[PDB]
Design a protein around this ligand. Structure first.
Ligand code: ANP
Ligand code: ADP
Lengths: 387, 370, 370
């Protein structure tokens, strides 16, 4: 039998490929590219007239299949959820576009946090999955994932662009093609995201905490108490337009301090795991502390994890979680496959799943008969097995 | 070749006749997961039993099929026996005859359904039900004397003289180990440490077994416990969290001697033994005072014998000598009796065969009780 | 001192203040402290770092809400003292705590340290002439004006059912569950995110509560309303933006009657009522079914009484009259009860003086509680 397909889903939109582990991971960032449109158009929007979407998936799907991957779509169907929280559109719509445009011969749909543990051989919690927005923490038990201890933040990195557009604009020399120093704004009213990104992609990094905090002291120059150290060296970014964007070495340092500010807001990038452990059964915390899993492209941001853990550990001493939990370590389990890759692999794994797959799958027929696909959030999930 | 299988509400003690200790000892519990419509991972069992249910407490809803020594859910009870025979013992029920245990003054429906399942479902060659209190005498090798076999479901006192039972003297009390656990949860919550869920109930039961002891003088011990913080001990939970039980440590087991605390509106376990002896013949009372046996695992509280001695002595005549028989191995005293009885060549005649069941019916169990 | 007592309802959601002479609570404000979201080191920003009631409502978008009380238990005492200081402020009531006595409404089955510490505050921090803690369920019966009656008090923090007959509260039949109005708001926020509306900030949690309070109906048949296409009723925010609630409106509160659906190990709101009655004596059970009183704020849901009556009828015995007598002022019933109790001449004996507390100690509050 032929296995299997893997879908774009967020930072993940770039994750087009097909099973097994050998597939290309074709990079689609994914947009249309419709001629009459300003390009590109991101067609990946919630709260969208579905029609608009309809026509978009139709066309994307058509496209991806059409070209991009050899697919011969009638034989392989997988939809990964990288969402649990996807609203019913568009899922309804996704199916809806199948289904009839695309005749779909049963489909199994599955979440990332389960596809996550598949690789470590671990059937237990914690999974933190961070990438395009809205970040999710979800202890997975052996077996049930447990939603009741459900947590979510931005960003992950979508907001880094405001933080960066802004800051780029708060620094400010562009050395324009006329050798003039000019304002960014106004030579440009905006910085396209691709710039922002590029700059980010290669320039942002996460500092060690003892000094991550002096970076914070720059904001807070209290009564002169600043102990924000000299920045690294400045960078001439060449900018397109035959412009040069000079960048302070100091921004590399600040952008990443969003992730980590403590306002009167909780420092949540850092909890999540902590606000959930307090929520979790005591009888399982023993596994959850200690056994942590981090997937998602944004943890490719270097030094992230350093702090991260330091922070967390740091925080474990805040009484509030301390008295509440007592302490212990944390150990990271990590695959060797890259952070982005674990969803993708656990999609490959799934071809193994063929004896099961067509069983735990939602039938085409059913759907043809009702068209109802269960949601965990519905009062009528039909027992599909009636069929 | 025969099997002894005690059908305890708390723990299932199973093994082969002639053995010293039971081969398979596991909790008699079924754990079904709180599964939502969200997809679950692989290696998922619809219903877990015994050590597996105790390991996965977090998600599993633990439901005891036996309530006050009565089988409420028979379908789950069959799954306990199925795990006992096929998995734990690694023996076919068709091969060996099975010796079963019943509490005294139980509903007639239990014996009727019990025999039907073993002969029809499991197709056992023979099955004999025995009284738990009677078996405990074989473990001690004593024909005369009263037994206080206190279980998780119920507590009963059955006086037997020279191997002759006084049915009118038999007393049953619904107060047992499981009710004490629920009482401990409530008073710990008043202290500060809150325990609500089924998984937490089992953790509090494990805490109870370690810390709790019987006081000789309840009022004097609480007065001293209030004054000094020497009795106060710490306990480490599965989580890093540590708890200090305080005065509630010895307060839980008091309910056995004063049921008014739980609100049972009944006499204490020491009063039940005395009341049973008073219902007994005047001549044999002397021997019952001389041979007061304590059986079951609910009498494994440190210093229960000391409190019992004082209370019974106060009730009993001043001239009479009161001797309490409390052997180190009380927990497995009922099963050991079953093993000794099953081993005895005389008992070979007492077995009810499949042929006898088919000819007579399920009513045969009622005729061959006593 | 002869001066009129000040009734204060210790509601996790909204604190209700006023005098025993008052027919209704004049002063009702949310039970939380509002601080600025950004940690302000510089001058020219919001001064005081404390906003309570209308001050919090004014600067709602700027401030960050933190409730000091969770499930009827005080986590941060410093914040609660500031809230109680706001009760005895120039803004609300405008009177001396040294002159007027106080009546508190503590939740049932709380830790003893919570009760002792709460009393300490009003005698040590405040120099109160007299203090008396009363039971929320008992006060509701004074408000209704009947001695006998089951009180199903579904609050924001805690839901508890106390059966009381002829002014006798059965302490063994009392049942308490932590799944209350606050949890429904948390579950609705999850369902609204599943509709595609994020409420990330603590300020946006109040808008989820506002949506629930405005538009939330309990369906008699959930499968018919799930199958039927909704009108998708739009709610308007202070900014002017609209939100389409749709099926989330009625399928959110379902977890009160069916908390196993999401995966919360509890009996349910309809179950706790029935079990609490079943615990009582056979003679009283029929009278308790015929006399049920709804209390608390989480009964104001549209079609609550209709759904509850149906769910109780199926569990309750056949051919029994079930009368659920709901007042129009369920939300404000508890405070009115306190005002009535304080007004009674019997109360004069009930409260404990500051001088008695100084001499006797902390234990005083426990003995006079009941
Ligand atoms: N050392 C101990 N300290 C305190 N309580 C104990 C101790 N040992 C047993 N218990 C209590 O006694 C109960 C039953 O004892 P157990 O050891 O289960 O014997 P059992 O014969 O299996 N009871 P049953 O399940 O009816 O057969 C337990 O659930 C505990 O509450
Ligand atoms: N009209 C309403 N419709 C639905 N829910 C409501 C309504 N009014 C209040 N609530 C809910 O009930 C809560 C109020 O609880 P309340 O009665 O003040 O508790 P307490 O008895 O502890 O003071 C609110 O926070 C909200 O969750």
């Amino acid at each position: 039998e032929k296995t299997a397909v893997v879908i774009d889903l967020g930072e993940a939109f770039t994750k087009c490929g097909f099973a097994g582990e050998t597939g290309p991971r074709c990079i689609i960032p994914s947009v249309i590219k419709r001629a009459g449109m300003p390009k590109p158009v991101r067609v990946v929007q919630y709260n969208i007239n579905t029609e608009e979407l309809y026509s978009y998936l139709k066309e994307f799907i058509h496209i991806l299949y059409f070209r991009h991957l050899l697919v011969n779509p009638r034989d392989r169907r997988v939809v990964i959820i990288e969402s649990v929280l996807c609203p019913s559109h568009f899922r309804e719509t996704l199916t809806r576009v199948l289904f009839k445009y695309f005749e779909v011969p049963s489909v199994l749909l599955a979440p990332s946090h389960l596809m996550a543990l598949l690789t470590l051989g671990i059937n237990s919690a914690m999974v933190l999955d961070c990438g395009y927005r809205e970040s999710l923490v979800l202890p997975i038990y052996e077996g049930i994932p447990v939603l009741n201890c459900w947590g979510a933040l931005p960003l992950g990195g979508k907001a880094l662009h405001k933080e960066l557009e802004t800051q780029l604009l708060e620094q400010c020399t562009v050395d324009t093609s006329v050798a003039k120093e000019q304002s960014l704004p106004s030579v440009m009213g905006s910085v396209p995201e691709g710039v922002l990104e590029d700059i980010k992609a290669r320039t942002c990094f996460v500092s060690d905490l003892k000094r991550g905090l002096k970076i914070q002291a720059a904001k807070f120059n209290i009564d002169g108490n600043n102990e924000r150290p000299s920045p690294p060296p400045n960078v001439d970014y060449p900018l397109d337009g035959e412009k040069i964007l000079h960048i302070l070495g100091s921004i590399r340092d600040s952008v990443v301090e969003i992730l980590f500010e403590q306002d009167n807001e909780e420092q949540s990038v850092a909890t999540l795991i902590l606000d959930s452990l307090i929520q979790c059964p005591i009888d399982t915390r023993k596994q959850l502390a200690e056994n942590l899993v981090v997937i998602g492209g944004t943890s490719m941001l270097p030094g992230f994890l350093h702090r991260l853990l330091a922070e967390i550990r740091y925080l474990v001493e805040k009484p509030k979680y301390k008295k509440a939990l007592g302490t212990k370590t944390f150990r990271i389990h990590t695959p060797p496959a890259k952070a982005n890759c674990v969803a993708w692999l656990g999609g490959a794994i799934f071809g193994a799943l063929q004896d099961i797959l067509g069983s735990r799958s939602v039938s085409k027929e059913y759907y043809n008969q009702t068209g109802r696909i269960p949601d965990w959030c519905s009062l009528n999930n039909p027992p599909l097995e009636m069929m | 070749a025969a099997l002894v299988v005690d059908n305890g509400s708390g723990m299932c003690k199973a093994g082969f006749a002639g053995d010293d200790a039971p081969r398979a000892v596991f909790p008699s519990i079924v754990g079904r997961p709180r599964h939502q419509g969200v997809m679950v991972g692989m290696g998922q069992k619809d219903s877990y039993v015994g050590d597996e249910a105790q390991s996965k407490r977090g998600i599993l809803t633990l439901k005891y099929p036996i309530e006050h020594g009565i089988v409420t859910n028979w379908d789950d009870m069959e799954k306990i026996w199925h795990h006992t025979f096929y998995n734990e013992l690694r023996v076919a029920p068709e091969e060996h005859p099975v010796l079963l245990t019943e509490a005294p003054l139980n509903p007639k429906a239990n014996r009727e359904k019990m025999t039907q399942i073993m002969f029809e479902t499991f197709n056992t060659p023979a099955m004999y039900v025995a009284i738990q209190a009677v078996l405990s005498l074989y473990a001690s090798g004593r024909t005369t004397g009263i037994v206080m076999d206190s279980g998780d479901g119920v507590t009963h006192t059955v006086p037997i003289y020279e191997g002759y039972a006084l049915p009118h003297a038999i007393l049953r009390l619904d107060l047992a180990g499981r009710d004490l656990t629920d009482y401990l949860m409530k008073i710990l919550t008043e202290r500060g440490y809150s325990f609500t869920t089924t998984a937490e109930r089992e953790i509090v039961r494990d805490i109870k077994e370690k810390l709790c002891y019987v006081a000789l003088d309840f009022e004097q011990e609480m007065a001293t416990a209030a004054s000094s913080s020497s009795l106060e001990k710490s306990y480490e939970l599965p989580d890093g969290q540590v708890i200090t039980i305080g005065n509630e440590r010895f307060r839980c087991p008091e309910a056995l001697f004063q049921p008014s605390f739980l609100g049972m509106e009944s006499c204490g376990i020491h009063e039940t033994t005395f009341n049973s002896i008073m219902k007994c013949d005047v001549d044999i009372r002397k021997d019952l005072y001389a041979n007061t046996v304590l059986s079951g695992g609910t009498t494994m509280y440190p210093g229960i014998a000391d409190r019992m001695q004082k209370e019974i002595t106060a009730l009993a005549p001043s001239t009479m000598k009161i001797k309490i028989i409390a052997p180190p191995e009380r927990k497995y005293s009922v099963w050991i009796g079953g093993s000794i009885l099953a081993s005895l060549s005389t008992f070979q005649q007492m077995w009810i065969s499949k042929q006898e069941y088919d000819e007579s019916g399920p009513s045969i169990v009622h005729r061959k009780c006593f | 001192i002869a001066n009129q007592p000040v009734v204060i309802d210790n509601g996790s959601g909204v604190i209700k203040a006023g005098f025993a002479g008052d027919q209704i609570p004049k002063y009702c404000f949310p039970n939380y402290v509002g601080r600025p979201k950004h940690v302000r080191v510089m001058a020219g920003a919001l001064e005081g770092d404390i906003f309570i009631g209308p001050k919090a409502e004014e600067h709602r978008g700027l401030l960050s809400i933190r409730y000091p009380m969770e499930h009827g238990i005080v986590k941060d005492w410093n914040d609660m003292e500031r809230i109680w200081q706001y009760v005895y402020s120039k803004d609300q009531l405008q009177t001396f705590s040294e002159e007027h006595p106080v009546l508190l409404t503590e939740a049932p089955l709380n830790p003893r340290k919570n009760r002792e510490r709460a009393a300490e505050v009003f005698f040590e921090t405040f120099n109160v002439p007299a203090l008396f803690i009363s039971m929320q369920a008992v006060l509701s019966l004074y408000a209704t004006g009947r001695t006998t009656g089951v009180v199903l008090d579904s609050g924001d923090g805690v839901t508890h059912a106390v059966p009381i007959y002829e002014g006798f509260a059965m302490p063994h039949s009392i049942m308490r569950i932590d799944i209350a109005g606050r949890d429904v708001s948390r579950f609705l926020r999850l369902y609204l995110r599943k509709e595609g509306y994020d409420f990330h900030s603590s300020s946006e949690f109040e808008i989820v509560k506002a949506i629930k309070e405005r538009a939330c109906y309990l369906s008699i048949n959930p499968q018919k309303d799930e199958t039927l296409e909704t009108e998708k009723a739009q709610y308007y925010l202070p900014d002017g933006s609209t939100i389409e609630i749709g099926p989330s409106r009625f399928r959110a509160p379902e977890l009160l009657f069916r908390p196993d659906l999401i995966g919360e190990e509890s009996e349910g709101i309809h179950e706790v009522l029935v079990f609490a009655i079943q615990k009582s004596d056979m003679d009283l059970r029929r009278t308790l079914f015929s006399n049920i009183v709804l209390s608390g704020g989480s009964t104001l849901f549209k079609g609550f009484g209709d759904r509850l009556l149906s769910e109780v009828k199926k569990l309750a015995p056949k051919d029994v009259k079930i009368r659920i007598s709901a007042p129009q002022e369920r939300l404000y019933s508890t405070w009115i009860g306190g005002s009535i109790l304080a007004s009674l001449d019997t109360f004069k004996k009930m409260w404990v003086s500051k001088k008695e507390y100084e001499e006797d100690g902390a234990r005083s509050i426990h003995r006079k509680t009941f």
